From a paper:
Intracellular binding of talin to integrin adhesion receptors activates them and initiates the formation of adhesion complexes, that upon linkage to the force-inducing actomyosin cytoskeleton mature into larger cell–ECM contacts known as focal adhesions (FAs). KANK proteins share a common overall domain structure, each with an N-terminal KN motif responsible for a direct interaction with the talin rod domain R7.
To overcome this common bottleneck in protein crystallography we generated a new version of affinity capture crystallography (ACC), a method which uses the homodimeric BTB domain of BCL6 as a non-covalent crystallization chaperone. Overall, the asymmetric unit contained a BCL6 homodimer and a single R7R8 molecule bound to the KNBBD peptide. By contrast, the KN motif is comprised of a β-hairpin linking to an α-helix. In this arrangement, the anti-parallel β-hairpin is sustained by intramolecular hydrogen bonds between the backbone residues, V33, Q34, T35, P36, F38 and Q39. Whereas most amphipathic helices tend to have only helical propensity in isolation, L41 connects to and stabilizes the C-terminal α-helix by creating a hydrophobic cap with L43, which maintains a talin binding epitope with both charged and hydrophobic faces. The interaction involves two main regions: firstly the carbonyl backbone of the KN motif β-strand participates in hydrogen bonding with the side chains of S1637, R1638, K1645, T1649 and R1652 on R7, and secondly, the KN motif signature ‘LD’ region, 41LDLDF45, where the side chains of L41, L43, F45 and V49 occupy complementary hydrophobic cavities that pattern the R7 surface.
Residue numbers in the entry:
A (entry chain D), H (entry chain D), L (entry chain D): 1 to 26, 36 to 51
B (entry chain C), E (entry chain C), I (entry chain C): 1354 to 1659
C (entry chain B), F (entry chain B), J (entry chain B): -4 to 128
D (entry chain A), G (entry chain A), K (entry chain A): 7 to 127
The structure:
């Protein structure tokens, strides 16, 4: 997700892959399947 | 002589890149029905797919495994096609969003799927009664065109659900039922005329295709009418200036990725070539830079934000 | 001696998985109670009150309508007369409930209205249905 | 048939966060201390029981600016506002008390109990 | 050091491809006087020529025979130039055929052939009386410019037969007879001043060039007048949308064939390179696909058919 | 026994080589007798009746004129006043006879009218003549 | 000088076939049985002596639709119509009689004699 | 008129050459130099 | 593995060529403030620089000396950038010179240098009080943003000297003095809080950044106002036709020189390749031909000469 | 015997190095004496007479103004009101003297007027000054 | 500070030569014998003392055409006119006398003395 | 300033370099630092 190694030491530029990751989120993540907010009555 | 059955993936993928390139030359009507936020989601998801594809292209062409190389070539192709489609759709929305621009309605029908379906029965008329294609072959000669007649009724049905004139909507439903009931009369021709077919009922089997062909000709003639003709939008000078950064980055992405696949073709034939790996490394950076500038331009140029 | 009482160090992020579903459910409760409904969508003399922010979050058309400055602060939005009222009704209920009710009869107006509202994901779902029945 | 779009709820919240990040149809400014915070009233009422009581009040439904109590921590409220649009609650070794206190001020009891669980460990 | 005198064909052919590419960028006035059906005939005939050229490029560069390789390179170049000229002409006719488009008249004169003919006598004035080009040389100094003065009268004659104003037509015929009779006075200067030329009559030989140069300057000044200036047509948005499929396929044909000749250059230097033959195979398909889409687009988009 | 009488099998195509010449000759006979002449071409107060289909088959200009919808069903077509009547007359006779009569005097009006009617093959022939005399 | 463009006659017929294939200025519809056939009157009169007699008739010169006799074979007439525009007469082991019969109905005696020569061998 | 063989088994795509042939005509061809149609009197 | 630290010059130079290419796609407002004669001088001087660069590219890549190769690659890049900038500027002047064209005013401010300067303080707010970037580091955290605040006052000062409305000019000077005096209050925070910084005065050091950040936010919000928004010029059809010969020759120069650097990359990795040297020779001619046609077009198309 | 008196053979070119400076100085003397001043430049009710050819040789704007046909033979040229009179005065004196007087106060109006007159070399010099003080 | 643009004087003369080569604002035609020469009056007065005396004359300041004496060599005047715009004086083994004579006719004494120096060697 | 020699006899086309030279000037050059023209009094 930044650079991958090709033969003879050259690289493949994957900076766009990391640029999308910085947009999706942006250290430990904690899940919580419980209800997050109050429920509104009908 | 080798790698011949792996080059076809590279040859066909580049053709698909040439085809989607046609979308960026002049957007005047939308490519699809994507929301602008849906274009951001499509571009970001295809970038995740294109990244895995490029790594597969290099690691495969490094040490054989040509079947996986063809999969990565086809995967990178379809990912770049999703890039172009979402970029052209977003570029159009940015253009028409200018207060001094116009709107361009899309055609109510697509006179291309009906043209191929017309040839599915036109070239099948003489292919069932001439010294070239004889009897027996009814499993293929009927099914390959029945899928198009059913798709004809499906395309003609949704075409009525979009027009405002009930005169056309009534005619679309009528023309769709004409192709359907004419095929329904052909169902009886398939029910019989199986083994007892020495001109025992073939005169009536063709008699069911006559209303099947003339109703398709009647539907195709109605598809090229006013209102149904698409209208291009009038993008203002400021709207053209705002959409070009998305278009230019999309054009550069395709031209840089095409040279990458072209270089990957030569390295798939023979990987022991440091200069060729250097050219691939150079194209990989211009591809990544074009994607970053494309995503950044689409994010900044939302039709709501200033 | 002494001792210090700290909840560790560093950073932590708690991911409320069902938070997005609770927000959409609460937004749907506001619509059912007509709470802060800032627009009414007229579809062939049939009115539909909803929230502009929810319409823009789901429909690419309503996003284009309310991002337009001279149409941003509009109380009423009249759609094209060729839009089926119940076809738009199924889509509007889908925006607040994530439920798309499709039958062999209404799928015509649903997909036609889906592409009018610029909802490509709904259009592809309706096309999958038709290509399977 | 009733098709269930499982990813629809997360896409609406993400798009609502895109509108806030671009100040699109933000109809209220939540002022805490000297910091400005623009958001959507519908999202604030859906998540905070306090803001629900504010904008349901007929005399306060059409308010453009809402000034919170000065004792409310601005950075603590920012983490809560970001949680409403991103479903992500970021807790540090310091701001955890400011987030817990601001959560109960906004009448977000489930976020309060989550901070009660995290402060135990 | 070898293949140096075979590369010039590749270098010059690509330049010719760069030049015809300029026709496709923005057609606003016709390239020539071809009928639309004549464009179909020209494209189909040049495709027959280009096919034989590509086979000659591969089979020559396979095993030496560089002279035949240079012939196939030049043949493929001129065939692609005929492709572009007929495609740009057809694309223009499709554009102006729209009922909401305009017409663009071509200039009555071409101020480029008269500019080169002006330099044929301008640089020849001092080249017949300065310490650089002395006497004797009258066989070349007179014939290389007499062909341009005769072509000047020919171009000026047909230019009068197209203008509506008899004021210009009278002036064109007058200006054409001025360059002719001034050269006719120079015929006497060539009749004499052969061996007896030690300033025996050279003062009168230049005295015949003075009305020959000032009349050419008078004709060139009249070529840059109103009406004679070309006017570009106003292609409607629908006319631009209809002509682009012909333009895009023509642009793709040139860019794909240019890379083919470029790859053929490397294979002509050294054919033992399987990766290079693979790149040529990839370009050969994109070339063929571009031609097929070009011919199909020109056939469907006749200014008469819907 | 019996025997069958069939003209062989397969397919066959008979190529009438001089058919194209006979059609053009018959079309010219129709013009000389004013049979189904559907248009009259006026060139500086000088009329010329011919067939629209033949004019479009030879001239790229007349093709553009009659493919124009608002000019398709026109009885009279007035050319530009700068068109020589006899220059157009030589071209019209060439369309029906395949004969191009060129002299050192009329070649000016022939080539000028040829490029006006968009007849590139005639223009190149006149240019070959001038580049040879 | 009189220049002879040898390829001109074939180019006019080919362009006339392009106009028919695109329905450009087709001024008559020849209806045989239930099949439609649009063509140009000038080409029909030049090749068929029958159509020449029809459109030379002053009361039938401006007819848009021409209905042939029902006994005329549609496929046989199609081969003749295609021959008028392409100079190509396609004969099979079956349709040869329908082409020969329709040719003499259209008063195309030279095409009839060609079919008489081919039926001999 | 479809594909020609290059070294190492690769091809040159000449499908456009065959595509033009299908347009020009489209099995035995027979020539006839005789008059095809009736001649119209002057 | 070698030549890795010499490829970066080729990779970065091509990116710069992709960026200047964006200037030629649609000139509607001037690139800079060059006189038309200044464009001739810039093009002729950059041609003198590009010539020495190409000779350096070949002679270096011939026999190692990769540092000098990277210098010639970067030199050829910047020379081609000056070509494009002067060509796009000249092409714009030729377009607006038509009597049926319009003028396009440039924006009074550039909302890009203020956006980067905003992130210089936005990302520096939390970078001075969170578990990530602690104290001590005040030599870097203050100087890297003080250069942007001083450049903010410089850019805001000259922006006032161009606007006609004294309401904006008064506000620009006011907003420039707000960022200056807020930093002047931060000078006292740098004067102290050196070693005695255990929250001894850091509460007041951040209290000086609060008016420093909110005044920058106030200045950035005023940069996106009417009048300040740039307006594109309306180039007439004749103006578009006259400027294209300069644009086409400039586009061909970049695309031909990009392939030259791309070929020079492969030859820098391994020079022993006669086919690759032939491709470089082919690109060198198309580059030279494009420059000659560019200079000739700019000379003939002066806004004064006919 | 005899002898010939010739100044050699071939060609020769004499380069007057300070000729360009003498022309510009003489042109400035003509302006100071109002000799053949063919235009007056008004900058906020402040007039400036000069030579059109010198203005076009230095300013890209004045080149565009007088190459315009409908503005070529203009006696008076009124600049935009946002142009500082003394800022234009420093530039005009620079055109005839090659001297650019820059201080920390007037450099604002000089560079702003320099880019208005399209004098890129002066703009880059002012930008160098500001990036150094 | 006073910045000295050393290359400014040569750029103005070069641009003035560009205007003459394109006939831009050329306000006088100097006719010698039968040859036309268009130039700018300001450049002619700056270099030639004769033309300075002509256009300073109030009755001759607005003259469009200036006809020199017939004895003036046209090619000699052309070398002088080119020198005024290019600072380059081209002298051959023949035209050197025509340039020297035309220079003193135009009252360009420094160009005369330069020709006096060159004719010595 | 016209062509430079690359390995294997190929060339680099520098005709644009010579084309600029022909524009800047266009055999012995002679310098003269003396005053060229008359000086105009104030």
């Amino acid at each position: 997700p930044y650079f991958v190694e090709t033969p003879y030491g050259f690289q493949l530029d994957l900076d766009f892959v990391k640029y999308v990751d910085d947009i999706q989120k942006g250290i430990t993540t904690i899940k919580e399947m419980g209800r997050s907010i109050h429920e509104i009555p009908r | 002589p080798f790698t011949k059955h792996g080059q076809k993936e590279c040859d066909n993928a580049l053709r698909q890149l040439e085809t989607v390139r046609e979308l960026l030359e002049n957007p005047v009507q939308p490519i699809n029905d994507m929301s602008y936020f849906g274009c951001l989601d499509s571009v970001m998801e295809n970038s995740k797919v294109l990244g895995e594809a490029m790594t597969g292209i290099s690691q495969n062409a490094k040490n054989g495994n040509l079947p996986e190389f063809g999969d990565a070539i086809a995967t990178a192709s379809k990912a770049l096609c999703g890039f172009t489609e979402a970029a052209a759709q977003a570029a159009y929305l940015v253009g028409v969003s200018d207060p001094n621009s116009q709107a361009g309605q899309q055609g109510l029908v697509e006179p291309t799927q009906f043209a191929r379906a017309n040839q599915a029965i036109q070239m099948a008329c003489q292919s069932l009664g001439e010294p070239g294609c004889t009897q027996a072959q009814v499993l293929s000669a009927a099914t390959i065109v029945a899928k198009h007649t059913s798709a004809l009724c499906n395309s003609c049905r949704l075409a009525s659900a979009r027009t405002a004139n009930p005169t056309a909507k009534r005619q679309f439903v009528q023309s769709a039922k004409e192709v359907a009931n004419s095929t329904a009369n052909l169902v009886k021709t398939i029910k019989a005329l199986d083994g007892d077919f020495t001109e025992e009922n073939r005169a009536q089997c063709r008699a069911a295709t006559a209303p099947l062909l003339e109703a398709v000709d009647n539907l195709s003639a109605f598809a090229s009418n006013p209102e149904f003709s698409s209208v291009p939008a009038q993008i203002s000078p400021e709207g053209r200036a705002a959409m070009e950064p998305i278009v230019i980055s999309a054009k550069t992405m395709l031209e840089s990725a095409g040279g990458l696949i072209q270089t990957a073709r030569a390295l798939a034939v023979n990987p022991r070539d440091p200069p060729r790996w250097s050219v691939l490394a150079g194209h990989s950076r211009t591809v990544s830079d074009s994607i970053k500038k494309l995503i950044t331009s689409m994010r900044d140029k939302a039709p709501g934000q200033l | 001696s002494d001792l210090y009482l700290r909840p560790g160090g560093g950073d932590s992020q708690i991911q409320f998985t069902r938070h997005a579903s609770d927000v959409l459910l609460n937004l749907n409760r506001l619509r059912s109670r007509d709470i802060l409904t800032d627009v009414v969508i007229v579809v062939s003399r049939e009115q539909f009150r909803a929230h502009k922010t929810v319409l823009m979050a789901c429909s690419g058309l309503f996003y284009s309508i309310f991002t337009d400055q001279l149409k941003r602060n509009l109380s009423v939005i009249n759609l094209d007369p060729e839009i089926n009222p119940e076809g738009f009704n199924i889509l509007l209920d889908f925006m607040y409930t994530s439920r798309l009710n499709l039958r062999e009869g209404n799928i015509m107006a649903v997909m036609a209205t889906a592409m009018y509202l610029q909802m490509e994901h709904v259009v592809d779902t309706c096309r999958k249905f038709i290509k399977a029945s």
